[PDB]
Design brief:
This is part of a larger assembly, with chains A (about 80 residues), B (about 200 residues), C (about 80 residues) and D (about 80 residues).
Chain A: E1 8-11, E2 18-27, E3 34-44, E4 55-65, E5 68-76
Parallel strand pairs in A: 3-5
Antiparallel strand pairs in A: 1-2, 2-3, 4-5
Chain B: H1 8-14, H2 49-64, H3 68-80, H4 85-95, H5 99-102, H6 110-118, E1 140-141, H7 154-160, E2 170-172, E3 179-181, H8 196-201
Antiparallel strand pairs in B: 1-3, 2-3
Helix pairs in contact in B: 3-4
Chain C: E1 2-8, E2 17-23, E3 34-39, H1 54-63, E4 66-67, H2 70-75
Parallel strand pairs in C: 1-4
Antiparallel strand pairs in C: 1-2, 2-3
Classes of the chains: A mainly beta (about 80), B mainly alpha (about 200), C alpha+beta (about 80), D mainly alpha (about 80).
The structure holds magnesium ion (33 copies).
Chain B binds one RNA strand of 648 nucleotides through helix 1, helix 2, helix 3 and helix 6.
Chain lengths: ~80, ~200, ~80, ~80
RNA sequence: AAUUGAAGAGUUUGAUCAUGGCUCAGAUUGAACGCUGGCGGCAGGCCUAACACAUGCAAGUCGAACGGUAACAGGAAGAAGCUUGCUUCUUUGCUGACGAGUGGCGGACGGGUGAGUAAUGUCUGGGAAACUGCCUGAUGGAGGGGGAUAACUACUGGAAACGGUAGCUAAUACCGCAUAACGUCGCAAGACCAAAGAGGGGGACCUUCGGGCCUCUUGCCAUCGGAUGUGCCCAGAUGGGAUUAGCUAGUAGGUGGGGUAACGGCUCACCUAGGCGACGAUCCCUAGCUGGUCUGAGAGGAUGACCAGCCACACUGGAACUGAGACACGGUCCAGACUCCUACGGGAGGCAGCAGUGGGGAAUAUUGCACAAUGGGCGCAAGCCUGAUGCAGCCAUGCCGCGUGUAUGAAGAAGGCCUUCGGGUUGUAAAGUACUUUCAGCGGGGAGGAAGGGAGUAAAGUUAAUACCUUUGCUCAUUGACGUUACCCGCAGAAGAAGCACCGGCUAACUCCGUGCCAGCAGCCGCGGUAAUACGGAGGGUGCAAGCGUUAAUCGGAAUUACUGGGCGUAAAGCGCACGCAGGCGGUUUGUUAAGUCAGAUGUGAAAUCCCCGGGCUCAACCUGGGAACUGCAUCUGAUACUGGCAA
């Protein structure tokens, strides 16, 4: 792997059109408090397999679509 | 650029001899010094801290005959340099050529010592330097140009030069009319009656 | 093709060149790839006046760079080994 | 507009017509192939391919379709024909 | 050694403390105006109308690709000017050369601008699916044919722009044919693709005396690399507004066809019904982004000229063609707006290149010189081109330097000014006296920016070679726009060279006369109605100086949007009260995780700038060496106290 991303699922309901939430904390660049800056990513998962609520590992591939530059690697947990 | 105006007037307002008629007579009088720098000079200038602060730097300025602009840059350079800003300021001021020409005696007053500089009648380490603000450094060697040597002025110049307390930081002939800026004058040389920290304050806010 | 040439960062009447490796198509004082020397032609006989990291110049001419005409002189004027 | 390389203008037309004809004739021979695939004729399909292969490869060499453009076409066609040929 | 640096004042009140705005001292400017104006160095110079443009110039070059001669230069069998060696025309392209044409390479660079663009952008850090002219490594290629055509000749239409016929001809133009692997398709077997010559010198030998032949150079074809350039994808960051809360049908995804140099809803067909959105979509408004620039002790605030990087645009809208590269700044085509030419039928053009013009404005320069340098195009070269550039001209617009004189000069003149008339002041100031001559003027001399290229010659690399070619010496004759250059010497005579604002308090500097709530002043307070230090003039003084004031503008002081660093009983401020979604926060224990946090390593954070230490221009501004710094971002590996996640 050249880096990997984790994140929860958020949306499985679409022929491989899987989108994943990623969560970082970051120091507010002005008032120093730490807030939640979320990222959604449109990831590929051949033969649809993850489900809403799954934690999942993900990696940056080339463009699979205007939107998709990431496939999944592994799954982790279910039935949240 | 040069002051050019009746020059005792200054010493009188500044209340002290700035040695601007330097020449012959000493401890002024034969002038009027003090009790009427103008038409109301007679009066007591009970004056703000700003004023005493103002007049000090003015005094220092009317002395080396330096105009505001240049003096500011002196201050700024002084402050840039590590060391007491006020000392550093006094250092730079002395480092002036024209000054280190009157100080070696070749010229009656700094004004005269200057006319010499501008009139290409001086040579540092051999070469002719006709700009009054040429900063002089340790070990330097300021001479008089052979052309126009022992000419008028420069005699009486090197004369009463010995009447004066007389430097230390600089050794200097008198026959050749050459002389060597040996070191950067220390605080303790020169001064007494000048108050840096005031003219540091004038330029601090 | 890339080239070794003099940029003129002088100052009216007292030129002082940087010597740079860059896309020959760019401006004489524009984007470059890396700096590889300098050349003060008013050097004065005092000290310095034409420092020149040869072992880089080398590298690029290996990678296909052409050299100016002036620079070519300087290199064959630095002598080379002494 | 008045400057020597008016010449260039009139030049790029000579070029343009040249490439225009060879560029069409080429896509014709290419068409003849996809025609047979839509038809069903596996033989005419190969027959078409074998006469267009050189002229593509060839055009590329000459440089109005430089490299891989040809490739794709062969690759594509080849798949198609023996997909059911 | 290298950010080691922070100040307050005036003004509400009779007075006070608090609260709180207003104002002021400071830095900064691509500035303008008013008065004034001596010289030089560096720099800056349409901020407005991305308004419109007369004229010149801003891109060509190669005869060592090609047929070539029209110009001028020579030469030539031979015809001659004849004044028998000096030479004239018919002609002849014979070569030096070269208009026009074909061809090659460059016109995608350099230079202009900030319109559009809140993201095909920019900055940071990364990723995989691609092409890449010239330059460069490697390995082989480079056979043998064919039909054209511009030029030109003849005829011919137009005022012009520029055309119509018919021929006629060369090549590095063009096309077959061969050849075909470490290339392309293909699991394989197999199938399939290319090219161009041109010079330089040369022993036999000899040829149709043109050359073969030898020989070196240079270009040409193919494949894989490099180098550089460019295309593309992801994430974060990069203005404002809810008096905009919903947005979306190629929309989101899949499958296949097509397409691109390349991944891809890029496109299509068909299927799924998705995709975005309060962590602010959509809509609206404004805007090129960066490095950095100004300010501030910092944190911030403000800003994006001049220098460098990226993007974007080239009269307006739209298109593609050529090409390695363009959807092309001085290319093409269509539409539009607008302008020019005309013989009235038709043509032509785009300054946001340089200069210049009109227009707008408070305001922003010469229709200059030169390729000498550096850099770029082409050429083997010599060279040609280069408003890039290097210089010059204009403006105190700014920065920096310098000068306009230096010493001496008293009972201290004259005049002015104040005065209790005693005197004070202007004032060592003037005059007088000695002295100096920078700068400007004048006259002499005279660096550097110059490397190289040209011939010779010498050796070496080659080769048949001592020829050519390339490389390295040697000598000789040379090459500067700036330029009356820098700098140097002499010449004359203080000779040509001082102004502007201020003086009630803040705030450095006081009197008189005039005026009388008038004329007027004023940054704030506030001055003016008979003694005005505040109006106007004068004497004197203070402040700055070839500048000085005024206006405009940013930040500062303002802890007056308070993150650092503030407040809400009565001064601005607790919603009339409650319940509660989202959101924020959350007792106590153990285990686990390693996201927040912390540590280290690596890479990256362009150069310039800033700063420290030096170096070079007589100093300085300016120029430059080298460090330091860029407080950031990412990757990897670790640490587990705190926070977050999971468990109990
Ligand atoms: Mg000055
Ligand atoms: Mg396909
Ligand atoms: Mg009151
Ligand atoms: Mg005037
Ligand atoms: Mg020609
Ligand atoms: Mg705009
Ligand atoms: Mg060809
Ligand atoms: Mg073949
Ligand atoms: Mg052939
Ligand atoms: Mg597809
Ligand atoms: Mg502050
Ligand atoms: Mg410009
Ligand atoms: Mg267009
Ligand atoms: Mg093309
Ligand atoms: Mg134009
Ligand atoms: Mg113009
Ligand atoms: Mg006007
Ligand atoms: Mg120019
Ligand atoms: Mg009198
Ligand atoms: Mg002179
Ligand atoms: Mg020279
Ligand atoms: Mg020299
Ligand atoms: Mg006062
Ligand atoms: Mg006034
Ligand atoms: Mg009165
Ligand atoms: Mg503040
Ligand atoms: Mg408060
Ligand atoms: Mg209240
Ligand atoms: Mg209440
Ligand atoms: Mg706890
Ligand atoms: Mg840097
Ligand atoms: Mg120095
Ligand atoms: Mg815990």
């Amino acid at each position: 792997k050249i880096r990997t991303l984790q994140g929860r699922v958020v949306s499985d309901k679409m022929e491989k059109s899987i989108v994943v939430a990623i969560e970082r904390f970051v120091k507010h660049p002005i008032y120093g408090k730490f807030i939640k800056r979320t990222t959604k990513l449109h990831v590929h998962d051949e033969n649809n397999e993850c489900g809403i609520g799954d934690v999942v590992e993900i990696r940056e591939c080339r463009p699979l679509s205007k939107t998709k530059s990431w496939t999944l690697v592994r799954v982790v947990e279910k039935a949240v | 650029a040069r002051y050019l105006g009746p020059k005792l007037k200054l010493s009188r307002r500044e209340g002290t001899d700035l040695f601007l008629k330097s020449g012959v007579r000493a401890i002024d009088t034969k002038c009027k010094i003090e009790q009427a720098p103008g038409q109301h000079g007679a009066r007591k200038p009970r004056l703000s801290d700003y004023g005493v602060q103002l007049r000090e730097k003015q005094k220092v300025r009317r002395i080396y005959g330096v105009l505001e602009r240049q003096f500011r840059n002196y201050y700024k350079e002084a402050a840039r340099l590590k060391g007491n800003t006020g000392e550093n300021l006094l250092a730079l001021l002395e480092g002036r050529l024209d000054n280190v020409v009157y100080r070696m005696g070749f010229g009656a007053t700094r004004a005269e010592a200057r006319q010499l500089v501008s009139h290409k009648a001086i040579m540092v380490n051999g070469r002719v330097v006709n700009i009054a603000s040429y900063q002089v450094s340790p070990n330097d060697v300021v001479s008089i140009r052979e052309k126009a040597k022992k000419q008028s002025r420069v005699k009486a110049a090197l004369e009463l030069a010995e009447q004066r307390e007389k430097p230390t930081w600089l050794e200097v002939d008198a026959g050749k009319m050459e002389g060597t800026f040996k070191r950067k004058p220390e605080r303790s040389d020169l001064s007494a009656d000048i108050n840096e920290h005031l003219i540091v304050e004038l330029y601090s806010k | 093709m890339v080239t070794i040439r003099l940029a003129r960062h002088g100052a009216k009447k007292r030129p002082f060149y940087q010597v740079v490796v860059a896309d020959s198509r760019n401006a004489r004082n524009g984007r470059f790839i890396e700096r590889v020397g300098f050349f003060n032609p008013i050097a004065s006989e005092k000290e310095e006046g034409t420092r020149l990291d040869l072992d880089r110049i080398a590298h690029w001419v290996g990678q296909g760079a052409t050299i100016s005409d002036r620079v070519a002189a300087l290199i064959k004027e630095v002598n080379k080994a002494a | 507009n008045i400057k020597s390389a008016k010449k260039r203008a009139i030049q790029s037309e000579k070029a343009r017509k040249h490439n225009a004809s060879r560029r069409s004739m080429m896509r014709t021979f290419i068409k003849k192939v996809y025609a047979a695939i839509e038809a069903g004729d596996k033989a005419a399909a190969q027959k078409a391919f074998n006469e267009m292969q050189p002229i593509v490869d060839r055009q590329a060499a000459k440089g109005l379709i430089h490299k891989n453009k040809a490739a794709r076409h062969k690759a594509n066609l080849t798949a198609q024909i023996n997909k059911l040929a």
